Amino acid sequence: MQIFVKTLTGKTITLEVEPSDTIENVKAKIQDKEGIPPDQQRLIFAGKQLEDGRTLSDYNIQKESTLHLVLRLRGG
Amino acid sequence: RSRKESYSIYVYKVLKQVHPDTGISSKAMGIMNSFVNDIFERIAGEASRLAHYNKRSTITSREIQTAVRLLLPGELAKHAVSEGTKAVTKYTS
Amino acid sequence: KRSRKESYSIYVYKVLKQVHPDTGISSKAMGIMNSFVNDIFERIAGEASRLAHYNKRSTITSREIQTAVRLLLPGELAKHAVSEGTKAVTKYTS
Amino acid sequence: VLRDNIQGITKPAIRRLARRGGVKRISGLIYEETRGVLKVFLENVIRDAVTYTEHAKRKTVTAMDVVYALKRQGRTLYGFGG
Amino acid sequence: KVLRDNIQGITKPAIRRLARRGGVKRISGLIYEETRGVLKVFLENVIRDAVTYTEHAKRKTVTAMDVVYALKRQGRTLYGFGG
Amino acid sequence: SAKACTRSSRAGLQFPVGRVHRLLRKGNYSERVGAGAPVYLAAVLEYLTAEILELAGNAARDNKKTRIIPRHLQLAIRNDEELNKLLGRVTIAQGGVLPNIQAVLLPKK
Amino acid sequence: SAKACTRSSRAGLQFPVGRVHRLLRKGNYSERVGAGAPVYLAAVLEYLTAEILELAGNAARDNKKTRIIPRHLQLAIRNDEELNKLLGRVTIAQGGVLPNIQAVLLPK
Amino acid sequence: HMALKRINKELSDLARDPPAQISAGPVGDDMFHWQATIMGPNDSPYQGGVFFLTIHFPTDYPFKPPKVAFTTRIYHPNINSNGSICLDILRSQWSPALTISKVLLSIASLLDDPNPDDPKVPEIARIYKTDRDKYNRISREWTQKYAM
Amino acid sequence: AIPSLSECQCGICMEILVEPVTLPCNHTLCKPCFQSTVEKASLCCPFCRRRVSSWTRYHTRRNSLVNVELWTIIQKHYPRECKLR
Amino acid sequence: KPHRYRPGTVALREIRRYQKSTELLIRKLPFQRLVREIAQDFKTDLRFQSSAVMALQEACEAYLVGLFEDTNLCAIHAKRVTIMPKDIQLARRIRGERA
Amino acid sequence: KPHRYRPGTVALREIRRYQKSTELLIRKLPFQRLVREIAQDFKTDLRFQSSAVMALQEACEAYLVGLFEDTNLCAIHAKRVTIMPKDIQLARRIRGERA
DNA sequence: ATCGAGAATCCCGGTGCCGAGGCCGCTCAATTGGTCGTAGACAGCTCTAGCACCGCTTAAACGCACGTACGCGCTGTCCCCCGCGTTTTAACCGCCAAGGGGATTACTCCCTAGTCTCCAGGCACGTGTCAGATATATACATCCGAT
DNA sequence: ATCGGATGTATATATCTGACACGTGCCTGGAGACTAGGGAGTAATCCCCTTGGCGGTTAAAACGCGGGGGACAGCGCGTACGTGCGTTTAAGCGGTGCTAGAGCTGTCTACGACCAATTGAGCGGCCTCGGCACCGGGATTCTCGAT
Ligand SMILES: [Zn+2]
Ligand SMILES: [Zn+2]
């Protein structure tokens, strides 16, 4: 299962995941293959925030899904 | 071309209402236009400041009346206020 | 309890501490400074709005405020204020 | 009701005001003219202040109305509000 | 195409005529230099604001509206030129 | 009113009411504009214009003329007292100055 | 500049950028307010405030005092060529007047 | 121009007496690009940690501040996930008299204790404020398996 | 007393002071650094952070920023580095 | 025999003293009564905030001080030292207040 | 045998003649050249609308007429009939133009 | 040119008081993120008029000479503010008492901005004609030297 | 005191020319009907602050008197300014030539308005201690009648 994610830099990243895999595993894969901690990294699909607690299977994620990645920076 | 608005027709109508025989030249027309614009700007600015100072958001008649009472001297202000009240009363019915 | 009333007290005191690290300010002079800040702000904003409306525009960008500052202030204060504001905008953008 | 209160501005008051103004010698007819001009100025300010406090549907002439009137006349005042 | 020492264009008879309109019966001999200085100061003050107004508009010609606006800002409102 | 004629005719005026209303709305004076404010403003403007024009017409007739020129406007404004205070700082172009000579400057008896 | 901090700190200012922006937007000055206007205006206001405050503190120290009073503000305002021109008609409450005696009135 | 001479003089200054626990050097051909290495302080939960960071020098120096970013990942309230550093002395407290040695010393001093006033990340900040033990344990479990 | 050789060095460019200026907070810099600082920096004392905006504006027209006595002392005592500049 | 100062040498002392001072030169109660009497003509039974009276007094004193400065300048111009009503009249005419 | 007027009557006749008319009193080309010189001193390569030059000339003439009225009043105030530079300076000082 | 005595002003030290700068609790507005209708930047075209040049007048400017009237300095006179001492008046500080209305909150209602559709009011353009400026020729007010 | 030049100003009349007054096509902005939603009107309540009042005590105001300095009128002068006439000059008017640049138009891309959630900057209330105000003592310095 290859999933495309596009960040704010326009880079398309292909990730190998499973429908039963939780978003925690996906975030661990992202931090391993990109070197960015998952605290500031979350997925966007169909205009809905992908909360880390809920798994991918509950979102009906299908083959070759397109995800958006946006960096969030907090004031201070 | 582009249209340029002016109060020339209305000033001419008022002049013909007051003096049926006298005419008016171009320079006096421009002077009247400038005077009308200046008075409009003065009254509108004073009314806006009055509306803002009292935590309001609309310019009703009474703000205009108080602006007129503030700007014009005694007799002119009294006559203008009377005329404005008469016009509003005639308009509302 | 009464409602909130806003003022420029904290920022003026911070500027005073930045200028003289050992001098306080009385309340009367504090209110005077607050009134001065309000007066200058109103003057600049009104001039900028008039200038923007004179050119058939609908927005107040830094150009209008800069021209208003040039018009309102004397010869040297205008130059220094323009320099400060240009520096602030340049630092804010990047 | 009150009457004949312009005499409250005594001669030493005018003399002290002139002394602050930088005046060394004062004639004897200055006081009446000064009282007249002060009265005129007070009427001019008070008329605008009373109009301002009448517009707001109030009954007490707050200091903010006086500040507004002075600013309108061209004599901006610092310290009492604004 | 620069211009040098052009303040002399406001000659003595012009100042005399202006004073006569003002209501002066007798004129001293040192009035003219002071009047020329005052006129230069006033013209500089007005033209500075006019040039600033034409600068803000990204335009290369000063129009009557800019001078009218500068005079209105300076406190001496002018009638009969539009506005 | 009858709510059948034009707005300026309904209020019994001559200056426009729609144009004044639009100028008030688009002039960035307030968020909202009342329904009676433009009528009052137009009435005030019309009264002031009528007063000035009447004075100028009288001045022109006194000078054996039929057209209002800036000189007549300047004379009418200056000779009045209320309008003189209202337009104290206004400079009428091509208007001139009132004729007067100080008493001292007159020839000795 | 980097994001993720207060707007008053991105430009290095001390006056509030957000409050100035809100006042400009809700002040009935124009339909739309640009992004760069509040920063520029706040910088100008802060510069003027610092300019007046420095001279006021200098006068206060010259008067053997460590607390700014309106008299020091009047002294600082009227002793500067440009600030006097800017604050022409302004009357500072309880500010007094500058010491000045005409040379003709002085004794011979 | 003047920036080249200033950079050369200060790299000489760091050469003939480097402060302890701090190293720095220009790896790229351009003098603006620099790298720096900091070892974990003894009085910290980051024991045994080594951190590599990069420094970018703007065109005009020293009147404009330089930029510093940690290449490595560290669980710190004042640091960002991507390596962006939120330090007071860089942007609103920059001064021409400051040098790279001083700013690295300040970075180490704040690595001794995170600033609670203006944290970069709020969740880890409030976790740290909640209890010291949880913050220490989580900082350890991040740093010992990220430093090496 | 004779000033120390350590103190006469400029803090900003680490060069011998040339026509230096003294800030009201008793911090001295060479004028080449000071003139370039004002246009595009915080316009304050670098070691100290003390605003000198009014001081700078007042002195610039008077052209009295440079300290004559300090400049003369180092210029006379150590002319050799001044000449090579 | 008792010591008496020359005419005019103590007026300079008064000028020096009052220019340094910043207090109010007119008494409070007479000015308050005058303000109330002036105001009651336009509308009845007004109530005055004390700050309004204070501001009115400050403005009046500032205006009178400025007027006395200008009239003293006019008197000096007229090759005199005393100030006379015609000096004040000329100053107000030039300033455009009365026209 | 030749007839000439006493000094003073021609001045009164000129005053009465000039106050009655409204034409401009300064030659147009010298004033326009002066305005162009000042503008080019301010900003280089500027072009002027004719109406702008006319407006500047009208404003300057009105200002100078007012200044001369005030100067005449000042000169009369000091038991004189000639206008002198100190009269202009005093009028400008009282008007607040130069302080 | 000065000495010295009477008097006003400034320095210094000691004591007391209240207001200003720091701290804590807290409610709301500034920040972040995203979405979307629109404004003004830009390239392109037209065509207005501001600039430069020339030549011919003749109206205003310039320089010089003559006289005269008035701006300034001086002298003298006089009278009226100034400075000081004494007496009478109410300003001011403090205190207490009462209540008018400014300020706040909750509820409801109706006034106006927004929308679309329709149409005529005035705006640019054109043409006819007479109000007034120009020139020419009388009639009267006014200024000046002098009996 | 006016008399008679002598000048300038006011007044009656022909005329013809460009600006004012009016007619016309049309198109852009004003007018008309309907909805919804927020701003403002209105009623009830609190307690803040404004008005009224009395006692004392004392700094400030009112009154009177001696007099010295400055306001003011008159005289004399000589120098700067008005008035007029001949001359050099640059303004003023006409006509033409042209191109810089103001003004209008089509695209569309990026800057800015709107809305929810959220939490930290800023505001209200407390408080305490140090800077400022006041008083008593002494040193310093303008000042004037007499040398
Ligand atoms: Zn240096
Ligand atoms: Zn320093």
DSSP of G6-21:
-HHHHS--SS-HHHHH
Please tell me chain B's helix, strand, coil percentages from 3-state DSSP, rounded to the nearest 5: 75, 5, 20
**Residue at G48 is within a domain:** yes
Range B25-92 classified under CATH 1.10.20.10 = yes
Note whether I20 and I3 are within 8 A (CB): no
- Residue C62 and residue G21: Cα distance in Å, rounded? 12
SS3 K55: helix
In the block, tokens 């930088």 appear at D22
Does F100 reside within a domain? no
Say how many domains are in chain E.
1
Is the CB of residue D74 less than 8 Å away from at least one CB of chain J?
A: no
Helix (H) or strand (E) holding B86: helix B74-92
Domain J11-95: what homologous superfamily? Histone, subunit A (1.10.20.10)
Q: Which domains does chain A have, with CATH numbers?
A: 2-69 (3.10.20.90)
Domain limits, chain C:
9-93
Q: Domain tally for chain G?
A: 1
Measured between alpha carbons, how far is G80 from G94 in angstroms, rounded to an integer? 19
**F85 Cβ neighbours under 8 A, 6+ residues apart:** B73, J99
Asked, for residue G40, whether it belongs to a domain, the answer is: yes
Cα–Cα distance measured from residue B3 to residue F40, given in angstroms and rounded to the nearest whole number: 27
CA distance C11 to D47: 37
Q: Are E61 and E55 in contact (CB under 8 A)?
A: no
- Domain at C9-93: CATH code: 1.10.20.10
Indicate the residue type of K22. T
Q: Which positions ≥6 away from I44 have C-beta within 8 Å? A: I50, I51, I52
Measured in angstroms, the resolution is 3.7
Please, are residues B43 and B34 in contact by the beta-carbon 8 Å criterion? no
The whole-angstrom separation of Cα K55 and Cα G36 is: 36
Is E46 part of any domain? yes
**Is the Cα dihedral B29, B35, B41, B46 positive or negative?**
negative
Chain L: bases < 7 Å from a protein Cβ: 6-9, 19-21, 28-35, 39-41, 49-52, 60-62, 67-72, 80-85, 90-92, 100-105, 111-113, 121-125, 131-132, 143-145
Those residues with Cβ within 8 angstroms of residue J49's Cβ, 6 or more apart along the chain or in another chain: D60, D61, D62, D63
d(CA I71, CA I55): 20
Bridge partners, F38 (sequence order) = none
* Measured CA distances, C4 to C7, C58, D71, H42, H127 (Å): 10, 32, 25, 49, 33
Of H117, D68, H42, residue with least CA distance to B52: D68
What is the C-alpha separation between I15 and I30, in angstroms, rounded? 9
Interchain pair J68, D49: CB under 8 A: no
Q: What's the CATH number where F11 sits?
A: 1.10.20.10
Which one of 3.40.190.10, 3.30.40.10, 3.40.50.150, 3.90.420.10 gives the CATH number of domain I20-84? 3.30.40.10
K34 three-class SS:
helix
In sequence order, the 6+-apart residues with CB closer than 8 A to the CB of J36 are D2, J46, J48
**DSSP letter assigned to residue C3:** P
For residue G41, the enclosing domain spans: 7-86
Coil, strand or helix at H60: coil
| Identity of the residue numbered G46 | E
What are chain D's partners, defined as 3 or more CB pairs within 8 angstroms?
B, C, G, J
| Strand M contact at CB of residue E6, distance < 7 A | no
The 3-state DSSP composition of chain I as helix, strand, coil percent (nearest 5) reads 40, 10, 45
Residue corresponding to tokens 């020839």: F107
List the catalytic residue out of H39, H69, H86, H121: H86
Specify if G102 maps to a domain: no
Bridge partners (DSSP) of residue D25 are: J82
Nearest protein residue, CA measured to C1' of M39? B57
F93 close to E78: Cβ distance less than 8 angstroms: yes
Which phi and psi angles does I77 have, rounded to 5°? -65, -45
Tell me which residues from 25 to 44 on chain K have a beta carbon below 7 angstroms from nucleic acid strand M. Answer: 27-30
Structure tokens at A54: 């809920």
- Domain contains E83: no
Domain that holds residue E36: 7-74
Pairing of strands J47-48, D77-78: unpaired
> Hey, are the CB atoms on B75 and F82 less than 8 Å from each other?
yes
Domain boundaries, chain I: 20-84
Residue with tokens 């299908």: A62
Which own/partner contact pairs does H137-143 have at CB distance under 8 Å and 24+ positions apart?
Answer: H138/H75, H139/H45, H139/H46, H139/H75, H139/H76, H140/H45, H142/H73, H142/H74, H142/H75, H143/H40, H143/H45, H143/H46, H143/H49, H143/H74, H143/H75
In angstroms, how far is L64 C1' from B80 CA? 63
Q: Looking at the CA of I24, which ligand is closest?
A: 2
Q: Which CATH code fits K9-95? A: 1.10.20.10
* Nearest to G15, CA basis, from G55, G43, G57, G50: G43
Rg (CA), chain B: 16
**Looking at the domain assignment, is residue D57 inside a domain?**
yes
For the residues of chain A, what is the DSSP string, one character each? Answer: -EEEEE-TT--EEEEE--TT--HHHHHHHHHHHH---TTS--EEETTEE--SSS-SGGGT--TT-EEEE-------
In 3D space, the residue among K92, K18, K40 whose CA is nearest the CA of residue E37 turns out to be K92
Q: For residues G56 and G79, give the distance between their C-alpha atoms in angstroms, rounded to a whole number.
A: 10
Q: How far is the CA of K53 from the C1' of L50 (A)?
A: 13
**Could you tell me the domains of chain H?**
2-147 (3.10.110.10)
CA G34 to chain centre: 24
User: Which residue ranges make up each domain of chain J?
Assistant: 11-95
Query: Which residue from E11, A33, A18, F20 is spatially nearest to A7, judged by alpha carbons?
Result: A33
